[PDB]
Write a protein that binds this ligand. Structure first.
Ligand code: SU6
Ligand code: SU6
Lengths: 646, 646
């Protein structure tokens, strides 16, 4: 059973989005066999002239952009003659489809979010610079296509259909006050349309970023409209999220992102301000478009430099503007890591990194987040570590309920997913920690060697001075046997008094070097005994359990779509439910008792090694400065004056 | 290609009303084969629990009333599982269907309108006394069924479906002000729902009564919403119709029904007040339901007495309350015919009608409008005649345009229909006029005969008096020869002086009677020479032409539905268009030059005969009173006193 046009055809089973004013199906071009999404305008629609439809056709074909779904044709159903719209097929689904994956239960991965921002604001810009302003933007009408390079492109749809077939042909029978309601409607195109879309856009961004809606009552926005209405309008500026955690409880207020959100500290820091005034409901403090575009463009144009604080044990994504200096870079690294520019010490691929007041970020060392710029202070601060939300498994209702079971499975799958992500990140922190530590000890060894070079360099100077004064005193006490032994003995005594200090440093250094040998004291062997390793394969164990859980979830989903099951099918469903319980509980017990525990042991040791290393560094600097002091003090003895002769 | 349930089945071609939120089809019960209207809830709908649907099922089955469409079942589509509603099939269509007939182009026939009132207010009452208030009532959702007795029953539908699937799942992405629009929506159930329906109801009543909407801009309510909105709210109280006849012209204002409306003067007089305050947009001067129900019930309970004014040549439907007196009846006949109670003279089936201060309307002579109560004054007033609108044929666009041709054909058919109605009514006025005239002359003859009976009755008295006094005077002038001749001669002379007057009346009467003979002067032969007759068959000639025109109209309608024609088909269409022109023009030329002309000749003669008859009546009354005078004057001579003797 299929519908058709001149050049297209589609099965009724091949339905897609399914709207009210129309429907969208997966169809094919009958000549090529290519795939297109067709939009049949249900069973009302057409009584409108061909002129308007062709001018709208024409104005809609000018829409040739990356972030807008292409409109290939306007056509007519064969045996029904009600309009169909030939548009681009997007096999991946929409942003809503992406968000419904339990892997994105707590927000999209950062790169994907950046892509979403870029795309949505792009389609918005291209839409506004031409005709039509997109009234409402949601995940539902933001389609996803996979580009030729593998990474997604998001496209705006549903904007031309601004048809007003609602009201309540009851037009010519209405009481004047329904017309006054229509007055209350038409006051929106004034300005509440060039700033009213931005609300939906902001809510969308928050949804994709956190994996949750910004404003949610006790058990759902729609499932309770009153307190929803009461929390939406009653919200003050700066606040980006209001949550009613309790039944008839109040509201939790936050101008920051949820702890569950794993978006980088920098991106988040650049994102919360835009969400603040895009979520306002009064006047010019709601920015308006142009400033929102300028700002979002500013954010999206930036390049990221990955830096890792070995002191706080924290990873960092620095959002620098590529064309801006290294000064503002140090000020950013400061802004996140609370260590001021002068204190900052950089490491890259086993060696120091040194840059100046105005080295632009373009020529900066290319950083991934497995090989970033390590950064350390000199000012003894505590470790901080990963900041994640501690999400526990929801209770698995001892029951039978295909819908409730599907939802529960979704929840559990999402939680276990967050667990895997967290474990992976923790392993990464431990790895970057180990490598960074090894580089740091190697580097301290470098500084040591340089110091020794200096010390010996001044020791040969002291030596030549002393044995030269002895040479002269000897070849004079024998030649002109006569005596001023006072002066030469004084300065000789001075040189010896320096030699003593030299000996002191020469032993103290062998001490400092002894505690950089394998032996112990400051060996990095703790990093080999503490924490978790890739060889432990905990991430992939968690991943196996997650795969089982996900299997059971998809099965429960199809069971839900089955409405009700057969006998054996039902029993299998229950068996699988308890199996899901065991998988989940096992996974989380492994996360806690194996990942977090050993991780925190590692972190603690890392603190109780960072203190040691910083101490030794202070010492080494101290006696290096000692060596310089000695050098310049000995430099005063190379051309000492002599008595005037006859 | 068909859809199905457990007990029902329907073709997709058997579609009916076709809505947006759903669709209605003509289907059958698979076991019985009976016809039912099924309502498939399109392709969204169901995500709502069975509990609510069963409580609504239950509360909707309590709706067992004459003016509400029965709901037989709630069921489920077989291979699609989206809800279907099993309801009563109404083969005749809706009130909209009835109104789209050109015979009702200028308003429904009166009995049908009364039926519509009764029905709509009945369904409204039964709806309000239970759950649900009908938000919007239009011809579109007022179905028509033909009862067992042939006369229609109208039923309200579309009231349970108060589903709110509009707004613009964009609920949880909306700006606070759309929610404030929702606030502006929910303020309607307050009271603007128990008085907001009455507007649509009133507009409906006006639509069915006049054949046109109450408030129409230059070329359509919908085709121009601005000035529509401006005329709806800007309307003052008492005004029931505002019409923008010109393009950008102002408005014509009327608190009365259009001249085209053929509803009786009495019904109209009872209808315009209800339409006035049901079409208000502020406070308690908008009546409210209970008073509207009480009033409409008052109107609908009344019985009609048909009366015909032979003086103004006008028909009248008197809406009396059956239980009320003949006094208020005379006051009604007064209110329409401007002749006061005492003046009114009634005739029924060839004879006088006489009734008293309190003869209730139940036992009144049963009146149709072909045999009514004729009524006449005694106070010489002009004829008025039929009051109809003078509607001319629209121009038949020398062109080719299937839609425009269909519309034009509809217009022409309606106009010619109004012409036939008007001609028929005119023939009726002439017939009632003739019959009434014949009865009136026969009745005047009655009065004459009675008068003559009286006059002779007193003549034998005068005679016996005179010849008795002569007898006595003679038998005394011979017996006691002696003389008082003065007295007897005086009274004898008096009796003779009376006899003279008697002679005068006796001749004047023969004159008055001579002009009631066939001969002439006041013969009713003008009614046989002037005007139009049933034997002329003008109504059925107009009817033949109307049938041709209607044939062409239906053909043009199907041509319009064909979108475009074949070659020969097109040529035939044009030929038929010009044929339609000739039919219409011929019909109207016959109406003017044959119906109205002779009618008005008749009417004029009727005036110039009414004056004569009233004059003769005044005379006859005068000399009847003369006869009474003479009688009582002669009664003073039967026992005259005599002289006292010894
Ligand atoms: C794969 C796909 N396409 C669509 C719809 C469209 C599509 O492809 N082009 C479009 C262009 C305009 C509007 C809708 C579409 C849907 C709803 C889905 C399924 C989504 C899902 O399974 O969650
Ligand atoms: C004959 C008929 N029934 C209907 C619809 C209904 C019907 O029968 N019961 C109903 C009960 C509830 C709602 C609609 C209907 C329509 C639109 C028409 C056609 C009207 C027309 O041709 O103008």
């Amino acid at each position: 059973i299929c519908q058709s046009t001149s050049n297209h055809l589609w099965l009724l089973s091949d339905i897609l989005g399914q709207g009210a004013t129309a429907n969208v199906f997966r169809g094919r071009h009958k000549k090529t066999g290519d795939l297109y999404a067709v939009k049949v305008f249900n069973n009302i629609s057409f009584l409108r002239p061909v002129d308007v439809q062709m001018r709208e056709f024409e104005v809609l074909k000018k829409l040739n952009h990356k972030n807008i779904v292409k409109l290939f044709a306007i056509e007519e159903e064969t045996t029904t003659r009600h309009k169909v719209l030939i548009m681009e097929f997007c096999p991946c689904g929409s942003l809503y489809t992406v968000l419904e994956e339990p892997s994105n239960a707590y927000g999209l991965p950062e790169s994907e979010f950046l892509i979403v921002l870029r795309d949505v604001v792009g389609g918005m810009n291209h839409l506004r610079e031409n005709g039509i302003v997109h009234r409402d933007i949601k995940p539902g009408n933001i389609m996803r296509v996979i580009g030729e390079d593998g990474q997604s492109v998001y496209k705006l749809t549903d904007f031309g259909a601004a048809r007003e077939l609602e009201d309540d042909g009851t037009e010519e029978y209405l009481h004047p006050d329904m017309y006054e309601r229509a007055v209350l409607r038409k006051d929106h195109q004034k300005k509440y349309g060039a700033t009213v879309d931005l609300w939906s856009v902001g809510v969308t961004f928050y949804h994709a970023a956190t994996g949750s809606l910004p404003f949610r009552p006790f058990e759902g926005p729609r499932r309770n409209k009153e307190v929803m209405y009461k929390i939406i309008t009653g919200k003050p500026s700066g606040a980006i999220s209001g949550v009613q955690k309790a039944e008839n409880g109040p509201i939790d207020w936050s101008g920051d992102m949820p702890l569950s959100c794993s978006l980088s500290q920098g991106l988040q820091a650049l994102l919360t301000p835009v969400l603040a005034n895009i979520l306002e409901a009064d006047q010019e403090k709601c920015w308006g478009f142009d400033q929102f575009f300028a700002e979002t463009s500013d954010v999206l144009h930036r390049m990221v430099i990955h830096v890792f604080s070995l002191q706080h044990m924290t990873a960092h994504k620095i959002y620098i503007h590529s064309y801006n200096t290294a000064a503002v870079f140090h000020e950013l690294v400061y802004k996140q890591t609370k260590i001021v520019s002068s204190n900052q010490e950089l490491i890259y691929e086993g060696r120091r990194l040194v840059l100046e007041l105005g080295r632009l970020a373009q020529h900066f060392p290319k950083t991934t987040e497995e090989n970033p710029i390590f950064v350390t202070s000199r000012e003894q601060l505590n470790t901080v570590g990963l900041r994640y939300e501690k999400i526990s498994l929801p209770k698995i209702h001892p029951r039978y309920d295909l819908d409730g079971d599907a939802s529960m499975a979704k929840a559990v799958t999402g939680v276990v997913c967050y667990a895997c992500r967290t474990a992976s990140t923790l392993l990464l922190y431990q790895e970057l920690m180990r490598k960074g530590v090894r580089w740091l000890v190697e580097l301290v060894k470098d500084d040591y060697n340089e110091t020794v070079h200096k010390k010996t360099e001044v020791v040969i100077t002291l030596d030549f001075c002393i044995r030269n004064i002895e040479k002269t005193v000897k070849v004079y006490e024998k030649l002109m046997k006569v005596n001023e032994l006072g002066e030469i003995s004084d300065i000789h005594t001075k040189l010896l008094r320096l030699s003593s200090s030299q000996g002191t440093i020469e032993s103290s250094l062998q001490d400092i070097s002894s505690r950089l040998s394998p032996g112990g004291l400051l060996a990095d062997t703790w990093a080999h005994q503490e924490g978790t390793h890739p060889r432990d394969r905990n991430v992939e164990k968690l991943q196996v359990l997650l795969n089982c859980i996900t299997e059971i979830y998809y099965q429960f989903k199809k069971d839900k779509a089955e409405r009700r099951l057969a006998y054996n099918e039902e029993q299998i469903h229950k068996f699988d439910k308890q199996k899901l319980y065991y998988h989940a509980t096992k996974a989380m017990s492994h996360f806690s008792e194996e990942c977090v525990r050993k991780y925190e042991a590692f972190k603690d040791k890392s603190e109780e090694w960072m203190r040691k290393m910083l101490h030794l560094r202070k010492q080494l600097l101290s006696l290096t400065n000692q060596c310089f002091d000695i050098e310049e003090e000995v430099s005063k003895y190379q051309d000492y004056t002599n008595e005037l002769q006859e």
